């Protein structure tokens, strides 16, 4: 009753299940930046990087080698920036290797689309890491986790 | 792809053709054996290399041999 | 004497004997006299003493560690250490091999050799077992009559 | 609301309310055991919530009856919620 | 030729079906006529119900198609199964009963491919075919 | 209708087929053209499903094989009882259980092996035993070698009865398939009769024999002075002295005035202070309650009189929107396939063995078993191993059912079909969780090792550093500690003192004390989870992909146990459900080895020990576990290197046998790698050369020598691997614990 | 005795077990009556 063939195609390697094809799942996925409609590949990358650097700052800040030091937050931000640069390099090499120069009009599956996406991701990631750094440095709650 | 070859020791038993999970081997006409038929490998690009043909062969060393060569999607049996 | 000292006059050997006997006596001190444990430990002590005395009188050579060493070079003064035991082995092993080969041929010339090999014909097997006592002359007779070694052209071989 | 590709699901919150009441009202059954105090499961849970809200930032200590009461009450509540959804959607 | 309007054996769906490689490279199909509605085993996993009449099925591998065909031939007594290969261009090809008759029985018209005029013992040595274009046959 | 129907004289008892090996199989009856026939004979000896297509014949064979197994087990028990009666120091152990080491085996003085007859105690020297039979007998109330002789006689008589029953029910009166396919009747009778009446009879025995005898023994009365069980049975006054409620009679029972029996039927909990084991008065009530429960449970199913259930109806009624047809067809599957039943029963039996190991150490049930540390360790590890093997066998027979007895026509859109149809999701998710657990459980140990080796000891995952506290387990322990009087009001003590409480000490030695969980315990528990999950991954992946996969669409045709499908498709080695069982057995060995090592170290470091006059307990290793068990170096040094001293310095002692077995098990484990790392072609070519050597002397076997099949080589490698590893651990554990306990 | 039972006794594993048990007994009794013989006495 609840589990059915995917797209009414019994022979595709997929099943239509509540987790996979429910109304909430479809709405959530279609509203995420990777799928939302209208966003340029640059804006998708901007939102995703903003979201990702923000949470990247935390683990380094609270569990890095210099976590019991005065410079724990700055060290965490600088490690976040390093990891962001590494991942931006990963994105760039993936884009140059996977997508050939044919122009499909910035669909995020093109050379230009992926270049814009990785540029936006780098910018947004660095910005989000900086924003998290500012908030942690200025708010005691975030420095103590509520202690 | 893999190179499948047949030799004159073939007796036309056809078990090599019947054992192939793909359709790589077929029986053709011949005069060198009592059965009057010999195995042939026209669709060698579909061969996977399982050597089931080799297993289903009754002649002292095989009349059919599979030499594993370059690998492709079909040879590797990759459904993805 | 070759490079070592006789074991009958070695302080190390005597010390090892004393240590073994003292261990056994310490184990015995905690058991009532005449009880099975006491009798067993006393018999162990007697066996240890007899073994050490016999090793001493055997002419065995003992090193600094206090343990007998074997001179397996061919010296006739130490034949009993490796050569005569080795001769006894070779005798028994050739017996076994000769009778096994004879039974293999016997089963080869049967109606069902495989059946004769999994379910044996123990009368014939015992016959061959008995035959095995003159295997050296029998084996040499087979060799000279040419029934032992097969020709190079009659043995299967892989291609080069 | 579609629970799957094309299957609709009501998702009635009155089922949730009914299951909550069905588990909680029996939970009022008092017991004089130290864990409950003298009260029932639901009342003990409310009392613990208030007591540990009065001391807000310090979690109920390990060994406090709060954790056991919470676990038992929520196990029963979830069981009743599953059963009530089953009844409303299959036997409804 | 292949008719893409043949119904399918009312399968309930599985995760063993074809994937993006089927849409990108190659997608095989098998068509067969059934005298009644039986239950058969999908080569990908699970049970399916074949229809009374013509049934068309899509798979990712020729081996899967031929395994299904062998199941039909042996388990059931269906031997009119035809196998095709479809490219994204839509260029359906015909493969299994290539000459309308199964390869296990000789048929006039076939040309021997890959046949050698000696036993395996007559193959040349790699030393003899080294730095040359000769073949070990 | 549930009724009895048998065939009379179906098979004639004759030795004709004893001389025809392979008679059961058509391919083997022909004869041994090669040595592979010899191995096939044994590999297919008990595969009754491949000998014939007759379910009736298979069921009859299984019934008679079960009778033979029961006869063998009864012979085993009679042997143990007879050895206890004749070659044991049981009387001395009864006189002073805390001073003399139990022993029931004696070796002959042939080549100096008499050293193995160590000074166990009580004027007796033999081989110390770690099976707990002495404690079993003490709990049962045995106080003489005469009673043990009678026990051995009863065991021998039952073995004879069982063998006769097997022969009779194969050759004289063989029940039919209709008789066999009575699931309702077979469960009613098992539950009520077998289990319920067994625990009822054991409760009666405990109430009339074990309880007073053990009461006097704990009071200190001599075993010779204690009266006899029939004296207790017939002298209600004598029993009314020890348990004053027997003067009341059975009127309280039949009037439901059950409180009158509180003296000998009590919910007390804890451990007997004198013996260190569970209260036998608690065990009697436990078994009586179990008898009531089982006899009630055995009245659930319909046999002949309308009242009852039908499992077919229950299963077919249980279905939901996520499962389509639900449990439809499972009743037919389980009453038509022995392999499905074997898989279920093996899985449950193995899990039961594991549960039994856990519960039998935290709540020592027998008198003077808790302070017999060798017995506790040996029993725990033994039952853990049996459980692991049973689970792997359950996987194997699930695969065998899937390949052989699975029919898609009868399984359409039911639970089995739906599992097969989404097997990819299950295996992918289990793969991800296995990788995640492996990382976050073993990379923690690697991190700790690296930090300790770099001197950053403050960056480790330790109680003195970043902490991983099992707060949930500690919370459960607190609950169980406080339950007596609060959530179990009528229980005087906690179920186990491991959860918390006071130390139980017998003979100035800890019987059971609280077990504290910290960071090391958190890590080792998550490693247990990792290993279990990986084992499940291997076994379940094999079972689900037994019939077909994207790689081999026709695998059921190849079978349940085939070597490969050739070097094609990139290589299809070990693709069958048999090879899945093979790898999963390797991983079960890994899992159980880690579990038993955890038990050994934790119990020697934080539970077991000697209690001083100060009331303080010094443990065997002394808290090594908390700060050493957090690094692989800590395990290598403080557990393996440290505790292997007892076994490697055992030469010249009564544990010299343990040292020799240590070395031999190492040898066998290494010898397995020859089969595991190698292939058949090399050995067949070597055999070709050896056969040339034999032919040069005009002789060679008519049964052509052949290298082991690929599957047989894998099986030999696995068997030797498991034997060597388990034997190494066996010698190590027994030597260490017998030296320090 | 039944000829089939005798053939079953003649089967390879039974004969191997009996023969090797006999050989083990021979060696064991030799070591029991003449123990600790590390050498041929000369
Ligand atoms: C690795 C080389 C080597 C080899 C192959 C041998 C071989 C031999 N040594 Mg040895 N030996 C060696 C090194 C070696 N030795 C070394 C390095 C030393 C010094 C440490 C010795 C010191 C040594 C001594 C002192 C003696 C031997 C003797 C012997 C012979 C004993 C059997 C015999 O005499 O049969 C003879 C019997 C027959 C030919 C037939 C017997 C027929 C019936 C069955 C009786 C044998 C040929 C003994 C001997 O007499 O050698 C000539 C001997 O007395 N060796
Ligand atoms: C108690 C001590 C002891 C024990 C337990 C063993 C055990 C063994 N020995 Mg023996 N051996 C011993 C003492 C011992 N040996 C001594 C003291 C010597 C020195 C003489 C030898 C010399 C010896 C040899 C030379 C050989 C063995 C072999 C063996 C193994 C196989 C035997 C066999 O299959 O027989 C059953 C018999 C047969 C299968 C028939 C064929 C093989 C025998 C040995 C032929 C005998 C006659 C032949 C003409 C001798 C020519 C020897 C020359 C080429 C050097 C077996 C593990 C064999 C081995 O390891 O093979 C790989 C082997 O060839 N042993
Ligand atoms: C825990 C609470 C609980 C329980 C035990 C049940 C039990 C039952 N309900 Mg349900 N029901 C519940 C809560 C519960 N209900 C709630 C909260 C609602 C409101 C949404 C409903 C609304 C409802 C309706 C409208 C109907 C039922 C009916 C049923 C029966 C259907 C079968 C079933 O559920 O098998 C479960 C039964 C077992 C014995 C399983 C035992 C498992 C143990 C605990 C482990 C059964 C007697 C039907 C009925 O009347 O049937 C006669 C029916 O028509 N229920
Ligand atoms: C089924 C389990 C079992 C096991 C593993 C053993 C094991 C043993 N028994 Mg046996 N035994 C058993 C059942 C068992 N017994 C039963 C059911 C009885 C009652 C009849 C006996 C009665 C018995 C006696 C009377 C003796 C043994 C002895 C022995 C030991 C030496 C046996 C031997 O070398 O025989 C080798 C025999 C061959 C023919 C080979 C050995 C530890 C002996 C012992 O421990 O002596 C110190 C001994 O004297 N057992
Ligand atoms: C071949 C495997 C094997 C071997 C060699 C042993 C060996 C041993 N077991 Mg056993 N055991 C095994 C498998 C095995 N077990 C399995 C698979 C289980 C799980 C069912 C058990 C459960 C078990 C228990 C619970 C106990 C032993 C004990 C023992 C030791 C004493 C032997 C004895 O006579 O106990 C006699 C056994 C008893 C007096 C206790 C019986 C109580 C159980 C609960 C009865 C269950 C019976 C029932 C019909 C089984 C089916 C249940 C199912 C339908 C759910 C000995 C080391 C005893 C021990 O450790 O003593 C110190 C012990 O108490 N074992
Ligand atoms: C199958 C088990 C079993 C058996 C064979 C017996 C047998 C007996 N019981 Mg019973 N008894 C049992 C279980 C059993 N009891 C249990 C489980 C309990 C606990 C409720 C009792 C409690 C009990 C009492 C209190 C008394 C007996 C007594 C008796 C005797 C007279 C009836 C007889 C020897 C009477 C007697 O004489 O005991 C010595 C007696 O007074 N039994
Ligand atoms: C209730 C228990 C039970 C039962 C009734 C069966 C029944 C069966 N199993 Mg088994 N199985 C079990 C438990 C059980 N299994 C367990 C626990 C496992 C996990 C290891 C397996 C794993 C398993 C597999 C993987 C397979 C079977 C197969 C079979 C079938 C044929 C077995 C055969 O011919 O053996 C005959 C007996 C032997 C071959 C002897 C094997 C013993 C080895 C060599 C080790 C013995 C060592 C011993 C303990 C001594 C060590 C000490 C040393 C010093 C000597 C049969 C239906 C086979 C099947 O169905 O194939 C189609 C099959 O492939 N089983
Ligand atoms: C301490 C005790 C040891 C000292 C005792 C000495 C007695 C040894 C007896 C050996 C014996 O009887 O050999 C019996 C064998 C029979 O062999 C058999 O001879 C057969 C033919 S026939 O018997 O020779 O006619 C032949 O076919 C067969 O293969 C072969 O095995 O006799 C011979 O074949 C040749 C004997 C050697 C003659 C020279 C010996 C000189 C001394
Ligand atoms: C037990 C835990 C159950 C998880 C909820 C699952 C739940 O209770 O579902 C139960 C749900 C109820 O199904 P129906 O009501 O259709 O079936 C009732 C049955 O009795 C008849 O078959 O069945 C499914 O949808 C199965 C889905 C398994 C879901 C797979 C994910 C879980 C895998 C296991 C990993 C769990 C880790 C959890 C932490
Ligand atoms: C799934 C689930 C279950 C239980 C409940 C629960 C809530 C936990 C839920 C999970 C929730 C989760 C995982 C939430 C995670 C939220 C995250 C990661 C939020 C991230 C927010 C990011 C933010 C603001 C970033 C702000 C960045 C800014 C301005 C950057 C500004 C800048 C940029 C981009 C470039 C130039 C410089 C400048 C101007 C500074
Ligand atoms: C060593 C080895 C061999 C050669 C080993 C063979 C042929 C075993 C033959 C051993 C004899 C016949 C057994 C009898 C002697 C033993 C000492 C007794 C113990 C065995 C019984 C208990 C069964 C293989 O054939 C092989 C095949 C496939 C993978 C790995 C291997 C492999 O590793
Ligand atoms: S099997 Fe070998 S012989 Fe028989 S047909 Fe195929 S090739 Fe010719």
Residue numbers in the entry:
A (entry chain L): 3 to 149
B (entry chain C): 2 to 81
C (entry chain F): 24 to 183
D (entry chain O): 56 to 147
E (entry chain D): 4 to 140
F (entry chain A): 12 to 752
G (entry chain J): 1 to 42
Article, verbatim:
Cryptophyte photosystem I (PSI) associates with transmembrane alloxanthin-chlorophyll a/c proteins (ACPIs) as light-harvesting complexes (LHCs). Here, we report the cryogenic electron microscopy (cryo-EM) structure of PSI–ACPI, an 885-kDa membrane-spanning photosynthetic protein supercomplex, from the cryptophyte Chroomonas placoidea at 2.7-Å resolution. The cryptophyte PSI core consists of 14 subunits (PsaA–F, PsaI–M, PsaO, PsaR) and the subunit Unk1, which is not present in other previously characterized PSI complexes. A pigment-binding subunit that is not present in any other previously characterized PSI–LHCI complexes, ACPI-S, mediates the association and energy transfer between the outer and inner ACPIs.
Two distinct classes of PSI–ACPI were identified: 1 with 14 ACPI subunits (2.66 Å resolution) and 1 with 11 ACPI subunits (2.71 Å resolution), possessing similar B-factors. Apart from the finding that the PSI–ACPI supercomplex possesses 14 ACPI subunits, we also observed 1 class of PSI–ACPI that contains 11 ACPIs but not ACPI-9/10/11, suggesting relatively weak associations of ACPI-9/10/11 to the PSI core. Apart from the 3 additional ACPIs (see details below), the remaining structures of the 2 classes of PSI–ACPI are essentially identical. ACPI-4/5/6 bind to the PSI core via PsaR, as observed in diatom PSI–FCPI. The Unk1 subunit mediates the interactions between ACPI-7 and PsaB, resulting in the shift of ACPI-7 outward from the PSI core compared with Lhcr2* and FCPI-11. The interactions between outer and inner ACPIs are mainly mediated by ACPI-S via their loops at both membrane surfaces. The ACPI-S-mediated EET from outer ACPIs to inner ACPIs is unique to cryptophyte PSI–ACPI.
